[PDB]
């Protein structure tokens, strides 16, 4: 009958459907096993050093997530507490970024699926706010633009293309992989809806000099009369600076910073599926972008590109915030920074590489091969795959397309034990290459 | 030291922070307990009859989800199989909608967070495809529009506003709560990037007459020369029609249907966080909308408003598809339809209500009070809250803002036992009202 | 075959049997799901503020319980250790109540299902001890009685009726909701088998003045020559006084207190199913009430109305005792008292209510509406149901039937977070009422 | 700090408190371990062949139990569904006993902790009903009595003593271990509140001839004019006869049977903590015994000696009923009967014993030693302890206090594998004895 174990049955004799949906059902145990088995050919997230996204949470947090995988977030009326936790996160992150708040005041911001959606909401606010200002002056509004560096993350290219905004990029120079504040301010014109600075480049983890950008842009504003704003893409750096570098002025402490995005699922220490965007003041979020629906129970102030979605990541974020606090996050970041140094040194000791990333910034290590003659960084990346390590290789954006680097992101769940094994295995790979 | 139970400690004496992040850490057990406890004041999803979103999956599927909550979907190179499963879902859903496919041909479509994102991608494709066509004819492209009914879901209003497209709505009439195909086709002009039909209105679960819309629009196309396309918002109906009403022509069988969206987390039987959008042919998705990145390992063809996101729902969807098959989905939908009838009858038997939803369509029941004099539907909604039921009340869109209805969505995890208890508790509520001002 | 998920099967199409037992079996997964689903229409115990019974235990204690749900307590020979733990609990509770015990002496008492059974065993001991004393003096024994306040818990009415004893009640006055010691002593006659004082009234959580009752009754005993005893119903207060108020003399420190009952599943911090009764000395438990059976293995000294029963609560009780100790229990009670104050203040701040409960006593808050004109406390109780809170309303006993109160019991698992949300939601309910007929 | 494992800490150096409650808390892990460890010196319930109480349930049922260990049953208003399930069980058991019920009429009965409480409620109803009848005739009511066999279970002795009713016992004869219907009817007088027959004696699992008792008592009723009722103590047999011997008339099919008790935690296949009592008609339960309280939310019709208690067993019972149905219970009982035969034969094959139990009745085997000279049954009981088997030895009641038997109860979780190992180990024990003084 159904007494056969899954591997004694005839279900393991058929490969999983690729094109058509099967006509008949198969036992749940069988479906679980075969899908689970093929998934083993995926890489191990914990060994995926290419990603900035968190790959480990406390078991206690796994429970909260599982207890609420069936809670659709968008059901505000049905789940009042879930909605409140989202608001509290916005408040806590807002204060974390030194937003102009009156202590018990409600912050302006929203939780998103990730920085991608956060960036596009921020962009929309900028575009609209700019359109309104111009229409009020009679001026034309057909050629909006944004100013960023060539190190800009794909999400800004998506925004530019889909929302018909021009992307003005400051090109990179050899040995200079972030956006030059000066060149950026010089590109600003009357059609610039904002200048987007990146606090933690995905290329070498460097923080851009937001304070300098603010200083120069304030000066230019006195001349041009345009009120060009700054947006800080703190996808990763947003949950690092406040704890490692509270001294660094990059946030709402700078007058021109009007909105900030940060990924909760990066250094916010949550599984993939959570991002945040904060606005300096209510005025920075045009009221006409906000919707109020009522077919689910009552009226709700929504500003998102998504609707139905899991609420587990929101809850998970709140857990991390109140469970860790400043203390916990500082400890985690310090551990990450420490491991970065350990990995950095180990690579310097071989005298085979050029460290192309900075000492401070995002906890990661980007490096190139001294003399990329007989062997390329791509070969090293492939070689490491055999050991289970996933370490990416890529070329820099113009005008540094001649520079190719390897990147290792240090996350919360990357212990010293793994760091030291990585160095050893990298050395082994270099030897295997010396004989080819 | 730390031998105190959470409720013997001093952590249960402080209320959870609302504004500022705490300076110090607190024990994991304590943080878990207090957050878990406050969450109890949330409603029970299983009793939330307001939602179309699935609130139950098999334990076996819970495991798959948990085993991959740390797999970031966007890491294509790192997780080849996760990406493949997404492709297979696109293929299977494409065939399910009778897309023009050559057996082993790869379908054109993408997985999304939900229908909201799917709709905006579909809209973008329409807008761009329209812009290109017009620019090629030297014609202007500054006033794009979309034609839908007033029963349109908020997501189309979002799209219209954010992507600067005009929303032309066909208004509702009393007793007529879907979009009239005729009036819709008459609104079509040279600037219409598409006509969006809804296969399962969130208002009364009715399927719009997509076939008629197609027939009329094909005729108008012969005259105008415009190539006005149809998009079917099958957020819910997409996973119902193929199994309950296969004969019904609403999908790619209709020549003018160029793209379809469907929510996996609705009647796709997956937890919240998964949607799909299918395109009839490659030509319907302008190539310049597609990106190819390579800073994570290699080049990948992405067309989404999101980037990093969980891959658990994608995997969960594939599980449901190959585990249930046509048979399983049919069985679930038949069970849902059956329970709808049971609830419908029970309400008819009281002769207190007007059933404002149809016999066939989305498994739900929308009804109004005969004689809304002494008591309103909103009162009934509040009353039911006491028993734990969440049943929404709302006024129809114009021109029917004088029509107020209650809606009960029947989902996969809504058994006959619950259906019958709902009828009983609704009757109890009506009596409690018969003795009030 | 059996590959269908429960919600794809035909078992969710039938409602659960109400009258007749089904002829055929159904899959275990199916039976589990449907029963589990209907149970969702039960209230959430953690939000049930009407109950004094514990609704949360440590996960470690859940394991002990599960590990022994199959251990039938009555099997003394088979489970020697389970029986010993029961004895240790009796000893520990006896000392906790300052019973006259020499070092390492075995206390006189038994574990019960709850205070209900404990009270009836205590009553039986009193009745029998009284019958014996009277029969020895040749005096009549046909009209026994007990003296308590009108605030007496139903369990004493059960005892009176089933064991044919007369219940003499001291009536309540407005603003005076406990038993007046003086009036009580005045009701005592030759047929009074005992005077039952309540240490924590279920009506306003007030402790009755047991010490005064003892003082007056000792005086009356010098006159009448009757040896009228006192029983303290410490169902809830029994696990509160020893930790919050050790100075308060209410227990065996008072000479006339002959027996005490306490509920382990109330503030003893155990799940429902455990109570205790302690006797001052061996002489207070007539030997002829004890049985010795031998059909299970050997002879055993049983004094209970029950036989077979779970032993998990007994084990759970012992766990709580040795795991928490004085320190743990004090911490839990202090937390409960603190939360009571927080809730009390929040209600005072609205100036809408009259706090009818005292500052010290059982951690709870009983309050009435100032001016019960346009709205009653019952309306507030119903309104709160919508949020998930269960807060009861009830009228006092004679002669205070004109006084209606709301009661909120603060238990171990009621954190400050919940306390503050309760205040907020109560305020919301008051506003919703300010706009009604 | 607290990094020490429990067995590396100083908590395993102190023995668990026996008399005084500890001053300080200890880590939960430590308390769990030490208590769990000492409990290992308890016998294994699954190997306890002395008990009639179920020692195993399906894992699915363990979940239901755990999900509701915090639901206090007595909270009717708070847990409506829990209360309903109790009612459904009463209905289903009532029909199972062929009670005079229409459709769909509500049965008269209540769930209890066990048969002990059920018996005392049944007794109370009898006593009261008898008192009323006599007071109406101006006759005296000071000497009530009950008629049973000497094989009567201790619970009837408890009732007799605590509720001051005289116990008239029909003595046992050698080879005759149940109550003789004739002698019983002859003992009936005007003061007999009922005759209690036992459907499954705890001594040899024999069913008493209830039908004969009814026939004789109906005749005597025609003469005496007294309306002497019958109560059937079906503690165990209640869940056996309906499935193995539906032909047997023992229940409400007999006119004189006015009430029946049965233990859910025996052959009802539930863990310890559930019993039931059914009444033939509403008239058999005097209305003045029923209480209606309202301090928890609303009025509720309670008739129990207990108050607060777990509701897990009630839910567990309902699960078993609808999950197994007639089919499941029959299968379980047939398996139990089969294993009884296997064990019976194995003992007959040794020609060392006298089978003192019958072929049909409760699935068990009671046997004595042929020639109890050099060795007693008690020695065999002790010997078996070494292997882990718990098999009791006991002497019959008068006039058979010379007969000593061993009893093996066959429960649901006693497979053929265990049955065969028992026979083997019993043979081993007999040999070990053949070589002793």
């Amino acid at each position: 009958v159904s007494v056969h174990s899954t591997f004694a049955s005839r279900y393991v004799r058929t490969s999983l459907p690729r094109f058509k949906m099967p006509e008949n059902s198969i036992p749940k145990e069988a479906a679980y096993q075969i899908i689970n088995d093929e998934l083993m050919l995926d890489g191990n997230p914990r060994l995926n050093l290419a990603s900035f996204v968190t790959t480990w949470m406390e078991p206690e947090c796994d429970k909260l997530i599982m207890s609420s995988i069936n809670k659709n977030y968008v059901d505000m009326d049905e789940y009042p507490v879930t909605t409140e936790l989202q608001n509290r996160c916005v408040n806590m992150i807002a204060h974390l970024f030194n937003a102009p708040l009156e202590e018990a005041e409600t912050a302006v911001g929203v939780g998103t699926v990730g920085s991608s959606e956060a960036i596009m909401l921020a962009g929309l606010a900028f575009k609209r706010k700019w359109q309104n200002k111009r229409k009020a002056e009679g001026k034309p509004v057909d050629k909006p633009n944004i100013v960023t560096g060539a190190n800009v993350q794909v999400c800004w290219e998506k925004f530019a293309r889909y929302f018909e905004v021009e992307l003005k990029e400051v090109k990179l120079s050899e040995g200079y992989y972030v956006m030059d504040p000066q060149q950026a301010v010089d590109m600003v014109d009357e059609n610039t809806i904002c200048v987007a600075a990146i606090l933690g480049s995905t290329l070498n983890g460097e923080f851009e000099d937001v304070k300098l950008l603010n200083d120069l842009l304030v000066e230019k504003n006195k001349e041009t009369g345009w009120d060009t704003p700054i947006h800080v893409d703190a996808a990763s750096g947003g949950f690092i600076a406040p704890f490692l570098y509270p001294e660094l002025e990059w946030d709402f402490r700078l007058p021109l910073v009007k909105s900030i995005n940060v990924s909760g699922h990066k250094y916010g220490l949550v599984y993939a599926g959570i991002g945040w965007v904060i606005w300096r003041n209510k005025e920075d979020l045009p009221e006409e972008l906000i919707f109020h629906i009522n077919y689910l129970g009552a009226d709700q102030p929504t500003f998102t590109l998504n609707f139905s979605k899991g609420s587990s990541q929101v809850i998970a974020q709140y857990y991390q915030l109140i469970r860790l606090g400043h203390e916990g996050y500082r400890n985690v970041m310090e551990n990450c920074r420490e491991n970065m140094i350990v990995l950095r040194e180990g690579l310097e000791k071989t005298e085979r590489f050029n460290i192309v990333s900075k000492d401070e910034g995002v906890p990661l290590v980007a490096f190139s091969l001294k003399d990329s003659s007989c062997h390329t960084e791509f070969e090293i990346s492939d070689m490491l795959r055999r050991y289970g390590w996933i370490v990416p290789a890529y070329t820099m954006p113009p005008n540094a397309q001649h520079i190719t680097v390897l990147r290792v992101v240090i996350r919360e769940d990357f212990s010293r034990t793994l760091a030291e094994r990585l160095v050893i295995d990298i050395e082994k790979v270099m030897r295997e290459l010396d004989e080819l």
Side-chain angles (χ1 to χ4, degrees), chain A:
Chain A
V1 191
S2 59
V3 308
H4 299 113
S5 69
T6 73
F7 290 110
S9 68
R10 28 66 89 95
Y11 302 106
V12 302
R13 280 190 291 189
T14 314
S15 40
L16 295 156
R18 282 180 182 260
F19 303 99
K20 283 188 180 180
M21 187 176 58
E23 281 286 342
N24 292 127
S25 304
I26 74 178
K28 48 186 179 65
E29 31 274 324
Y32 171 84
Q33 191 67 61
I34 310 179
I35 290 176
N36 183 77
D37 288 1
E38 193 172 13
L39 256 18
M40 290 188 304
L41 289 171
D42 269 353
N44 184 341
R46 311 279 314 281
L47 298 182
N48 180 8
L49 304 189
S51 173
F52 293 80
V53 173
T54 294
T55 51
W56 180 96
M57 295 201 79
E58 283 182 317
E60 281 71 23
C61 202
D62 283 2
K63 272 192 290 181
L64 288 176
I65 293 182
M66 183 161 51
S67 296
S68 62
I69 30 70
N70 66 350
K71 280 196 203 293
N72 181 2
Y73 177 81
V74 80
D75 291 355
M76 169 182 174
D77 180 56
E78 294 74 16
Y79 318 126
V81 188
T82 290
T83 294
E84 289 193 20
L85 299 192
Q86 197 257 198
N87 299 332
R88 299 177 194 175
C89 285
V90 168
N91 292 348
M92 294 192 284
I93 295 172
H95 278 98
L96 189 62
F97 296 158
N98 294 299
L101 286 169
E102 289 180 353
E103 145 261 20
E105 176 172 348
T106 296
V108 178
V110 297
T112 58
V113 164
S115 275
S116 184
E117 172 186 12
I119 286 171
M120 292 178 187
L121 295 177
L124 266 168
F126 280 128
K127 186 185 184 189
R128 197 49 150 256
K129 197 176 191 295
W130 173 83
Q131 288 174 339
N132 287 345
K133 189 184 64 175
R134 298 271 290 185
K135 285 174 185 167
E137 301 167 346
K139 300 177 180 182
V141 299
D142 61 309
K143 301 171 187 173
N145 69 63
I146 280 185
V147 175
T148 51
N151 57 320
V152 72
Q153 211 268 351
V154 201
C155 298
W156 291 97
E157 304 189 26
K158 295 214 217 83
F159 170 78
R161 184 171 301 170
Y162 302 157
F163 296 93
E164 294 163 17
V165 176
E166 181 180 350
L167 201 46
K168 282 175 153 55
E169 293 184 358
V170 179
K171 282 169 169 51
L172 272 40
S173 307
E174 187 174 349
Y176 202 101
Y177 308 98
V178 299
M179 180 190 67
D180 173 28
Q182 185 61 64
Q183 293 186 47
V185 177
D186 292 345
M187 284 196 183
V188 170
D189 65 20
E190 59 280 355
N191 297 320
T192 295
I193 71 181
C194 77
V195 177
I198 306 179
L199 192 79
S201 177
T202 81
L203 304 186
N204 75 331
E206 188 174 0
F207 294 169
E208 294 185 349
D209 201 344
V210 186
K211 182 175 177 57
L212 183 54
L213 181 67
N214 170 98
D215 289 357
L216 294 179
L217 226 206
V218 168
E219 292 308 305
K220 177 156 186 164
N221 279 356
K222 293 177 178 176
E223 262 51 39
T224 68
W226 318 323
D227 204 11
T228 313
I230 291 175
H231 178 85
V232 179
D233 181 350
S236 49
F239 276 111
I240 302 170
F243 310 112
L244 290 187
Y245 320 111
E247 61 236 29
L248 183 64
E249 286 186 335
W250 64 269
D251 51 27
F252 292 125
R253 276 172 288 184
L254 307 179
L256 283 192
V257 173
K258 296 302 172 65
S259 59
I260 307 172
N261 74 258
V262 62
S263 295
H265 57 227
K266 295 202 188 202
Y267 284 92
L269 305 184
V270 181
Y271 292 124
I274 183 64
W276 304 95
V277 52
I278 315 294
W279 283 277
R280 184 183 192 94
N281 284 300
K282 200 175 305 171
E283 64 171 350
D284 298 295
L285 213 195
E287 176 62 28
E288 62 263 40
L289 287 179
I290 303 177
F291 281 80
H292 309 262
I293 78 182
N294 76 358
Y295 83 84
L296 288 167
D299 295 36
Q300 32 182 129
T302 90
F303 178 44
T304 40
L305 302 181
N306 295 295
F307 194 62
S308 292
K309 63 161 185 169
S311 60
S312 45
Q313 291 93 351
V314 163
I315 294 163
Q317 182 71 104
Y318 186 74
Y319 170 88
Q320 289 293 58
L321 291 179
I322 64 91
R323 181 274 191 269
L324 292 181
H326 279 272
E327 177 186 1
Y329 273 88
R330 200 204 313 107
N331 287 338
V332 172
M333 302 310 157
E334 287 178 348
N335 284 348
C336 286
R337 181 185 179 269
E338 200 60 37
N339 281 323
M340 172 190 60
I341 298 176
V342 170
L343 171 54
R344 181 210 309 275
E345 294 178 347
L347 297 178
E348 289 174 340
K349 183 167 167 290
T350 73
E351 304 174 34
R352 292 177 173 269
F353 308 103
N354 288 337
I355 305 307
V356 84
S357 67
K358 304 309 174 187
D359 299 354
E360 314 307 338
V362 174
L364 67 78
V365 178
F367 52 101
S368 291
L369 275 165
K370 288 173 175 173
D371 172 41
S372 308
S373 55
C374 43
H375 304 288
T376 63
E377 292 83 357
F378 299 88
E379 298 181 33
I380 303 179
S381 173
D382 286 337
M383 213 78 47
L384 286 170
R385 267 306 224 292
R386 305 177 180 183
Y387 299 85
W389 299 113
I390 305 181
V391 181
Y394 52 98
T395 60
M396 292 303 191
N399 297 325
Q401 291 176 169
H402 59 284
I403 301 297
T404 308
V405 308
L406 289 166
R407 187 189 62 207
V408 173
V409 183
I410 313 296
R411 301 193 300 279
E412 174 195 19
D413 61 347
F414 187 80
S415 53
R416 183 74 52 91
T417 313
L418 269 32
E420 288 184 352
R421 290 196 68 97
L422 213 211
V423 178
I424 292 166
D425 290 351
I426 287 182
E427 293 170 353
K428 289 184 180 182
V429 161
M430 298 311 296
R431 285 183 292 186
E432 294 174 356
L433 289 174
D434 293 344
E435 273 83 342
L436 294 178

